[PDB]
DNA sequence: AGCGTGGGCGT
DNA sequence: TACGCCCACGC
């Protein structure tokens, strides 16, 4: 039970949000629209954040480590390291 | 497996 | 506002 006072009003979306910006982040997923362009491949996305992970593919960057020893694996993305890590174990 | 992308949060 | 982090789901 919050303070969500940013409504979508988009028909028959019920989602509410606590900032305007997290509301119109949303509202893109409506409109289709991709503010952001990666200047390697011209591919234009929704969200600078999703961009930035997207970069990753072209350069090559992979900050994310798996800490199993004598492991040398390395993930592009967090959630890419969460899975990897899963599979050690089972 | 690698990565688009939606939603939850943050400084 | 800029600019994310993490997680989850789905190809
Ligand atoms: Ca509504
Ligand atoms: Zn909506
Ligand atoms: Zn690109
Ligand atoms: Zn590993």
Redesign the pocket.
């Known amino acids: 039970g919050?303070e969500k006072p940013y409504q979508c009003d988009f028909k028959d979306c019920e989602?509410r949000?606590?900032?305007?910006?997290?509301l119109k982040?949303?509202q893109?997923?409506h409109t289709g629209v991709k503010p952001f362009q990666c200047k390697t491949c011209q591919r234009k996305?929704?969200?600078?954040?999703?961009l930035?992970?997207?970069t990753?593919?072209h350069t090559g960057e992979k900050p994310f480590s798996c800490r199993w020893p004598s492991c040398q694996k390395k993930?592009?993305?967090?959630?890419?390291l969460?899975?990897?890590h899963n599979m050690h174990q089972r």
């Open positions: 919050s989602r949000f606590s900032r305007s910006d997290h982040r949303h893109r997923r996305f929704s969200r600078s954040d999703h930035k992970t997207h990753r593919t993930f592009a993305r967090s959630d890419e969460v899975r990897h």
